[PDB]
Design a binder for these strands. Structure first.
Ligand SMILES: [Mg+2]
Ligand SMILES: [Mg+2]
Ligand SMILES: [Mg+2]
Ligand SMILES: [Mg+2]
Ligand SMILES: [Mg+2]
Ligand SMILES: [Mg+2]
Ligand SMILES: [Mg+2]
Ligand SMILES: [Mg+2]
Ligand SMILES: [Mg+2]
Ligand SMILES: [Mg+2]
Ligand SMILES: [Mg+2]
Ligand SMILES: [Mg+2]
Ligand SMILES: [Mg+2]
Ligand SMILES: [Mg+2]
Ligand SMILES: [Mg+2]
Ligand SMILES: [Mg+2]
Ligand SMILES: [Mg+2]
Ligand SMILES: [Mg+2]
Ligand SMILES: [Mg+2]
Ligand SMILES: [Mg+2]
Ligand SMILES: [Zn+2]
Lengths: 62, 206, 217, 129, 97, 87, 117, 96, 25
RNA sequence: AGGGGAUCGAAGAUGAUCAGAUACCGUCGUAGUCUUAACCAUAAACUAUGCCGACUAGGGAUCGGGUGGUGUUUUUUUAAUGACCCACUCGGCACCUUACGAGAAAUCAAAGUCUUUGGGUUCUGGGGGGAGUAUGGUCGCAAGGCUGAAACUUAAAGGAAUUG
């Protein structure tokens, strides 16, 4: 159908999002250390659950 | 097995030719041809009444064995045998079902007529089909009286009769009633007939 | 407190029947879900799907959920239950019952050497529930349940250690898949192997043995 | 037209063992059938059969005994290496434990366990279980 | 799906038949088909035989009847309700009403 | 169904039907258990001792559940002249 | 028009079954019975019910109407259903046989008086 | 029956009818007719480097609505004209 | 459109392409 | 092409109808409709269901053949023949019911005997469009038949049944 639309606004949203810098933080371990760190996490200590165990919830329900 | 008293004795055989149970339907059926001795001209059939009696005794033999004679449901919907399965119910344990069968009986427990027999006896499989169907969902042996064009489906031992009216159904019901009493029960010394009139298992209107 | 209303049910609350296959031997229509409730507790349950369906009423629309549940242990006994109803909770419940009122006997066996504890099936069996036709094949030890995650978990409760599967048909309608993966393992008791060629004398049916303690008042 | 003989036969046996029947007629009686019936009789999947002399081709009556799931024929009578026998019994037999795929070698029509043991092979005939 | 096991009407073991014409539509329906009613009546109808059998000579006499045989089309049979749309079970009945 | 050490596994051994020898399935609820009592010293049926024939749902839906009984009755002698092998 | 509802007719099938001796053909007395063996929350229903029970009575005592059974009728129908004549079986002049039925006996083992038809 | 012939001497009829039917199979024809080597704008090769001609603001299909930002490219190795899509936000401004 | 007047159309469309073609033999 | 040319009737005209009405309805009528001698090769040319074979289930009709029948009805005397009846057996056009079985289902005595997959054998089809198009070939006086693509395009198209 129609083929010359308006180039006038390419890059609109990215060029108008407030730039944010990454908050630095101490690096995560690499290799076995991370995978170990993962192991004790998901099923050794156990944190937040719903009967179903929830991986990435933020502010939860409360 | 069954000695020699259990043979014929043409006083029994007199009842049969008297109730007319010997007369067999014109429209035969392949599962009923052994019971046909011969066919009378002018369109008729003749039941091999020996086998009728032979099965009858076999019939009674099945009615026994089963313990509590009460929950051995004798059924009819046809009016002609209704009064008969009431008298049979009266004598033997035999819980009766006269009139409509009301679907849901053997299956479906909640109901007001949840019988759980261990044997069933039926007058006419055509008109009583709903009993026979429903039985077949719950492992329940089935006795029944069968003319020649009667559905052998889902039935077991079949007594061959006439079920076209008159005295056929009561007699075979009366006789069943007799030998269920000779065997175990309270008759013994089968050589003599019965203190009970036959013409009691019959119809009304009057 | 359970109260039985069927002959079968009285005998089992009694103690007069100790095992389940007693009923399967005599083709006894289990009606009260309490029976298998008691003839085999520890029986594990898994819900598999809760999918919605619809309908139009003499006005607008109609909507409700549909629960599909398997019940079983892992020692030859499994059932399938599907029941759709107004709520998710009531759906699950109502169906578990339905699965248990239909648990089936499984004939496990050997693939080759009979070297201690059956691992796979007697023979090949194959079910069908319209289009979708599931067929199970014996498998050497250590093999595993090779099937859809759905049928895996269903044979898991069925108690199969190794088996191969061959799904044909629209396996995406999950319902008719399981049912025929059910129809399959239940068929196993119907394949006349020569082991069973040898005749037994036919038992007596506890409905006539305990016929006294069997009837009502 | 008739194109196998063993075929209609083993189909009649197969069909009738389903409808509950305990006997079955067969037309027409050919040697090949007989040996196939001989294989089947010995392993106990039918009973005794009876030839019939009509100076013609023949008839057979075979007694059935339950425990016949299928008696198949495999057409055309494939050439079966002696190693490739495994790949047939794998395909069309219900478990390693039992079942029989009767072949047809120059040593004679026989089952596969037998040829298994004689170390001979040939052309697959059919199969029984 | 097939909405009639007789397809149209009664051919079977043929594959063609002569055509009849509707008496209303003047259609061409295959004779095998066609709703087909026999119209017998009376020359004088019911109400007039009194003034008829009065004013007429002869001893009483033998009333004639007009004989006609109507062939219709499904189109004109249905509208003029010679035949009428019935249920899926009911349609099966071939017995006269 | 045996095994390694001649030990007997497999839940139950299903019943076999008496007119077709074909197993009676666990849910063969059209199958029938026919208990026929015996007769001692003239009449007087014996409770407790039966002649029990088994039949499967198939044979009884087919309609041979009678012909098969009469045949299986004369088999253990309970009838005479009824079933005629020759037709 | 006037069609009484099930809640009424349910109540009439019950009182007639449970209280056939004490019911009667009159509307007035039953109304008083009802204030005894029953708790009816409104006078009209009280009257309407008793009206229907009494309707049945005027056709109960004239025939055993369809779906109701009580004691003194069940005991009434058990007697009447025991009539036994001097019999018809009997035979008042031997057994009338057509044919082949005769041959049925001849080839069975039996006496019996006969006839050819 | 089963439609096909089952003869032991018929491999000819069998091996050829399957050939004479692989042609209804799409991606088989495309391989045997080399459409890829023929009418495809690339050569069959996974990539092709062309020159950018005019730029196009191609509207999107239904039921969407946006300006898709593309380029008409002169593939060097064929001279074939080909319109191609530029991805991510504002990348249209990186190509000239 | 109905597939019988669609059939008609493709025949007029062919009779007309036999024409424009042999416009130069 | 010749005959034929009642009739009905594509075209066409003319009357109404309609907002328009090339139409439905009404009137007039060409061709055609019939035949002969040529062609043409297509229809939902349908059972939308290849053919020979074997098998698995009951029931009453009906066509053609034959057989059995101290059956019937026919004369002037009850015999031949004629029709008719009963049973039957082959081979028909089907119907009826069942369902063991099969199917996505409607439904099928085949569309059954198929994941327990092999009796013999011909043919077709492999997403919807593009398109029965383009192009070559060939048959046809012609109309057209027969053979028959591709680029590009697109995520549904489509069956059966369910409730609205
Ligand atoms: Mg399929
Ligand atoms: Mg037609
Ligand atoms: Mg035609
Ligand atoms: Mg494509
Ligand atoms: Mg451009
Ligand atoms: Mg068309
Ligand atoms: Mg056209
Ligand atoms: Mg015009
Ligand atoms: Mg025009
Ligand atoms: Mg010419
Ligand atoms: Mg043409
Ligand atoms: Mg065509
Ligand atoms: Mg076609
Ligand atoms: Mg048939
Ligand atoms: Mg015909
Ligand atoms: Mg044209
Ligand atoms: Mg979309
Ligand atoms: Mg279509
Ligand atoms: Mg549709
Ligand atoms: Mg609808
Ligand atoms: Zn018309």
């Amino acid at each position: 159908a129609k083929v010359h639309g308006s180039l006038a606004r390419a890059g609109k949203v990215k060029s108008q999002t407030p730039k944010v810098e990454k908050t630095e933080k101490p690096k995560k371990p690499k290799g076995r250390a991370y995978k170990r760190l993962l192991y004790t996490r998901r099923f050794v200590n156990v944190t937040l659950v719903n009967g179903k165990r929830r991986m990435n919830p933020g502010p939860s329900v409360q | 097995s069954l000695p020699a008293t259990f043979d014929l004795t043409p006083e029994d055989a007199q009842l049969l030719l008297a109730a007319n149970t010997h007369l067999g339907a014109r429209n035969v059926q392949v599962h009923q041809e052994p019971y046909v001795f011969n066919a009378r001209p002018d369109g008729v059939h003749v039941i091999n009444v020996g086998k009728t009696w032979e099965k009858l005794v076999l019939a009674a033999r099945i009615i026994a064995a089963i313990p509590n004679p009460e929950d051995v449901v004798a059924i009819s919907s046809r009016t002609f045998g209704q009064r008969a399965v009431l008298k049979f119910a009266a004598h033997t344990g035999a819980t009766p079902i006269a009139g409509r069968f009301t679907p849901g009986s053997f299956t479906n427990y909640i109901t007001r007529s949840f019988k759980e027999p261990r044997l069933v006896i039926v007058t006419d499989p055509r008109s009583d089909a709903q009993a026979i169907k429903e039985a077949s969902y719950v492992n329940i042996p089935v006795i029944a009286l069968t003319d020649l064009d009667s559905p052998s489906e889902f039935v077991d031992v079949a007594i061959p009769c006439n079920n076209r009216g008159k005295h056929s159904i009561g007699l075979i019901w009366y006789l069943l009633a007799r030998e269920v009493l000779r065997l175990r029960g309270a008759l013994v010394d089968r050589t003599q007939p019965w203190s009970i009139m036959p013409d009691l298992y019959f119809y009304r209107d009057p | 407190g359970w109260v039985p209303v069927t002959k079968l049910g009285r005998l089992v609350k009694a103690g007069k029947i100790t095992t389940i296959e007693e009923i399967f031997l005599h083709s006894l229509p289990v009606k009260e879900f309490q029976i298998i409730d008691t003839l085999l507790p520890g029986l594990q349950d898994e819900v598999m799907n809760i999918k919605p369906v619809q309908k139009q009423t003499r006005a607008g629309q109609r909507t409700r959920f549909k629960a599909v549940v398997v019940v079983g242990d892992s020692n030859g006994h499994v059932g399938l239950g599907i029941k759709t109803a107004k709520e998710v909770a009531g759906a699950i419940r109502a169906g578990i019952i339905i699965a248990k009122l239909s648990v089936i006997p499984i004939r496990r066996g050997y693939w080759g050497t009979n070297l201690g504890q059956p691992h796979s099936l007697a023979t090949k069996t194959t079910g069908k529930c319209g289009s979708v036709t599931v067929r199970l094949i014996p498998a050497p030890r250590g093999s595993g349940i090779v099937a859809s995650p759905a049928v895996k978990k269903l044979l898991q409760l069925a108690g199969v250690e190794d088996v191969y599967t061959q799904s044909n048909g629209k396996t995406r309608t999950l319902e008719n898949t399981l049912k025929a993966a059910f129809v399959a393992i239940g068929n196993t008791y119907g394949f006349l192997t020569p082991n069973l060629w040898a005749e037994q004398p036919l038992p007596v049916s506890p409905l006539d043995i305990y016929s006294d303690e069997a009837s009502a008042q | 037209t008739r194109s196998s003989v063993l075929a209609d036969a083993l189909n009649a046996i197969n069909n009738a063992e389903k409808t509950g029947k305990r006997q079955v007629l067969i037309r027409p009686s050919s040697k090949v059938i007989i040996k196939f019936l001989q294989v089947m009789q010995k392993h106990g999947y039918i009973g005794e059969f009876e030839y019939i002399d009509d100076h013609r081709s023949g008839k057979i009556v075979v007694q059935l005994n339950g425990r016949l799931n299928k008696c198949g024929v495999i057409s055309p009578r494939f050439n079966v290496k002696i190693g490739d026998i495994e790949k047939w019994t794998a395909n069309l037999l219900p478990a390693r434990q039992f079942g029989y795929v009767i072949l047809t070698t120059s040593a004679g029509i026989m089952d596969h366990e037998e040829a298994r043991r004689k170390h001979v092979s040939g052309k697959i005939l059919g199969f029984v279980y | 799906p097939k909405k009639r096991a007789s397809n149209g009407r009664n051919k079977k073991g043929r594959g063609h038949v002569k055509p009849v014409r509707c008496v209303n539509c003047s259609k061409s329906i295959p004779k095998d088909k066609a709703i087909k009613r026999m119209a017998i009546r009376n020359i004088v109808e019911a109400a007039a035989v009194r003034d008829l059998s009065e004013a007429s000579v002869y001893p009483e006499y033998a009333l004639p009847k007009t004989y006609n045989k109507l062939h219709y089309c499904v189109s004109c049979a249905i509208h003029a309700r010679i035949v009428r749309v019935r249920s899926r079970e009911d349609r099966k009945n071939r017995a006269p009403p | 169904m045996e095994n390694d050490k001649g030990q007997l596994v497999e839940l139950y051994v299903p019943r076999k039907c008496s007119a077709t020898n074909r197993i009676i399935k666990a849910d063969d609820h059209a199958s029938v258990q026919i208990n026929v009592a015996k007769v001692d010293e003239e009449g007087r049926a014996i409770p407790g001792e039966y002649v029990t024939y088994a039949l499967s749902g198939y044979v009884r839906s087919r309609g041979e559940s009678d012909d098969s009984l009469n045949r299986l009755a004369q088999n253990d002698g309970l009838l005479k002249n009824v079933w005629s092998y020759s037709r | 028009g006037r069609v009484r509802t099930k809640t009424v007719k349910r109540a009439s099938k019950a009182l007639i079954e449970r209280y056939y001796p004490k019911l009667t053909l009159d509307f007035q007395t039953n109304k008083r019975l009802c204030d005894e063996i029953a708790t009816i929350q409104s006078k009209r229903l009280r009257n309407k019910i008793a009206g229907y029970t009494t309707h049945l009575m005027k056709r109960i005592q004239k025939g055993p109407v369809r779906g109701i059974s009580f004691k003194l009728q069940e005991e009434e129908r058990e007697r009447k259903d025991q009539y036994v004549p001097e019999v018809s079986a009997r035979s008042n002049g031997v057994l009338n046989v057509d044919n082949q039925t005769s041959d049925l006996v001849k080839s069975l083992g039996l006496k019996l008086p006969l006839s050819v038809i | 029956g089963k439609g096909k012939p089952r003869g032991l001497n018929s491999a000819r009829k069998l091996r050829v009818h399957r050939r004479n039917n692989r042609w209804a199979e799409n991606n088989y024809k495309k391989r045997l007719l080399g459409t890829a080597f023929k009418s495809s704008p690339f050569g069959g090769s996974s990539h092709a480097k062309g020159i950018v001609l005019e730029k196009l603001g191609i509207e999107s299909k239904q039921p969407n609505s946006a300006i898709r930002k593309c380029v008409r490219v002169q593939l060097i190795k064929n001279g074939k004209k080909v319109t191609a899509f530029v991805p991510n936000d504002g990348c249209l401004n990186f190509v000239d | 459109m109905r597939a019988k007047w669609r059939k008609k159309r493709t025949r007029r469309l062919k009779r007309k392409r036999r024409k424009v073609r042999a416009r130069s033999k």
